[model samples]
Target: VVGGTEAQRNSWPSQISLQYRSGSSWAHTCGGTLIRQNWVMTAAHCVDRELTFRVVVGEHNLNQNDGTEQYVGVQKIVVHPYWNTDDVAAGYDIALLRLAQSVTLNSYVQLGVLPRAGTILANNSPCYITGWGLTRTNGQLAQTLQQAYLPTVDYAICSSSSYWGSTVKNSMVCAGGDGVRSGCQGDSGGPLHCLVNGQYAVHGVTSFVSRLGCNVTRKPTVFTRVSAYISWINNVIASN
Candidate 1:
């Protein structure tokens, strides 16, 4: 995120670092949410590179082992059938990664809770976006996880001409247009956890930010609405 603070240990147990094996080292590519013992939810663009990827749970820092990490190979990748890399605005920017083995759930690693199917957040609903992405646009990646408060922006305002215009759809969620705190590159596929009725749910999948910068007025971070694909997610896991 453009302006964020380092997240506490085990605060976001469902957050995971999605890495790609690069020769002798694993590089953090994107963030994902552990939705099941064997499945992770992320953006389709993250896995489109066709590389050997893995998921690291309970990961607080990328450069060092905190002694609570679980490294697992990606056994399968199921990108949304309608996802188009060239046309992200169409809003099918989601994917699922099945792990080679089920991960152990505990204090530092747990499954993310999803919103009830078809549930939509009202305008300015309280939420936070978490990831190990950059702190600024075109800047270096952060070594530790970070989080920023990003309230929900209604579809009507986000789709207006002064805002995201026609680029955003009802299938997506817009948050953090404050021009200070926002999701940047490397934050893609992370969770937009919104608070509803005293509980937080994975409401969005970090999709994209403005090309001009990480934080821009009326160009809040856009995410694939997780609630909009609850059935698809369940179908994939059940079938696979």
Candidate 2:
């Protein structure tokens, strides 16, 4: 994430690293949230490529072994049926991956609490975007997890001509258009943790940023609104 600080190890337990096999090594590609012991919520675009993928729970630093990490191979991937790779602005960028084995929960590894169905944040509601994305628009990914305060930008404003315009859908959440701090490359599929009713909940799945740049003015980071897909998420898990 651009203009972010290193996140506390236990601050966001549900945060996870989605990695792909590169040569003989695994490389972090995106961030995801552990929704269940064996299920992860991410952006469908993150797994668009045909490659071996694995998830690392309790991972803080990408290049070092933190010992709290639990690595699991992806067994199945189910992208939203309406998701169109060529048209991300159309907004069905969500996906779920079933892990090969159920991971153990600990202080550093736990399920992300999802927002209630149809829940929407108020304008400028407190929230944070966490990931190992990039420190800048065309920069390298961070060694450690990072987080930036990205307050919510209501749909009306975000869909304005100067902002994200009509590309910002009601089924999505927009945050951090300050042109300083926002989600960048490699942060896609990560969680947008929003504080509601005194508790933090996973309200968004990082989807996209402005084509102009990662932290562009009036181009807040866009996310798939998780609360809008509660039923779909449940059905996918139940039928799988």
Candidate 3:
């Protein structure tokens, strides 16, 4: 994310690196959250290319071998039925990736908690986005994980004429439109962690940034509102 600093290894245990095979190595393309022992929550668009994907839990550094890493193959993908790659504003951008095997829980890897159904964050609520994404608008991917403060922007301000306009939907969460602290190019599909009742929960799935740039004034990064689809998420995991 743009204007972010390095994140501590255990600060976000549920964060994962969604990668694709690249030649002789692997390339980190998107970030996701471990919602269950065998499931990852990410944006549907991240896997739309049909590339083989894998999830790396406890991945703090992408370029080195961390002792905490757990690599797992994707056994299945369940994209939201209404998700449309061409129309992100319609708001069904979520997806679930089932891991081939269940990962053991540890201090470096754990499950992310979700909010109750239909929960909505208040205006300017405190939150953070974490990922191994680029630090600049169109820059190279980060070697280490990073995090940025991205306070919630209420639906009213986000969908206003001066902001995202009709592009921001009720099923979306907007944050960090300040142009300084924001999600960048490689941060999509990451988690938007918001603290509630002294505990942090996965509230949003990083979806898109403005076409003008990654850090545009009054154009916050948008996310698929996780709370809006708790039932759908539960159904997918139960029947997948």
Candidate 4:
């Protein structure tokens, strides 16, 4: 489901591809979920000073002959006050984008549920990762959305010295493997979904890392734990 014009139909049971633009150039920092007319969770690093961005929801291919593109402007940008890229232990790297207009609720685009507190996700947790990131490290981003089955990694194994060391925190989770399947370039700010009560809930926001090769076995991909920032996120959405 990564590169074809009509492959989105086969990616997930239901999904949407978000597209943003900076000036006259298109950026691949796409994210998606099942939320209806609500804010989109993404990485703070994707935010720019430029205010010329727009979100295209419910479409797989940006270059398709027929698709829906919602040109909503960003009303506010909220980066975690404690977010520090140098120290991964800060445990806060997520951000929210408030669209100027609400998206119409539909089957393709709907809201997701949040995981409960103290939920320990293990390998084979039945999770999914969707994005328009690069198929290869140095390759170009795909126009169509791509998805892969990602198993959750144990915290003990994820925090091993050979991996992220002590930098891995309780507020974070890991996914992917030694290049067999993983998020590469342009996948940042996207959602990592897990099913709870038979519904998709966005449990993580795709964050940063050192490489795009992704074969480093211990270097599991990190995501912003959505539950940790629930209060902050709710306030931001309420005020806006």
lDDT of 3: 0.93
Tens digits of per-residue lDDT, candidate 1, 154-220, equal 9999999988999999999999899899999999999999999998899999999998988898899
lDDT of each: 0.94, 0.97, 0.93, 0.64
Model 2 C-alpha lDDT per residue in residues 1-240, reported as the tens digit of each score: 999999999999999999999999999999999999999999999999999999999999999989899999999999999999999999999999999999999999999999999999999999999999989999999999999999999999999999988898999999999989999999999999999889999999999998788999899999999999999999999999
- Measured by C-alpha RMSD in angstroms, how accurate is candidate 2? 0.5
Error of 4 at 227 (Å): 2.0
TM-score for candidate 4, residues paired by index = 0.85
> Where is model 1 poorest over a 10-residue stretch in terms of lDDT?
133-142
Model 2 Cα displacement at 235 (Å)? 0.2
Error of 2 at 213 (Å): 0.9
RMSD of each: 0.6, 0.5, 0.7, 3.1
Q: What are the per-residue Cα lDDT tens digits for candidate 4 across 29-125?
A: 6564434375766776566344455566666665673355455566666677777766556677777776777877555555666676556677657
Which of the numbered candidates is closest to the native, going by highest lDDT? 2
Report the C-alpha displacement of residue 138, candidate 4, in angstroms: 1.8
Q: Which pairs clash in the backbone of model 1?
A: none
TM-score of each: 0.99, 0.99, 0.99, 0.85
Pairs clashing within candidate 3: none
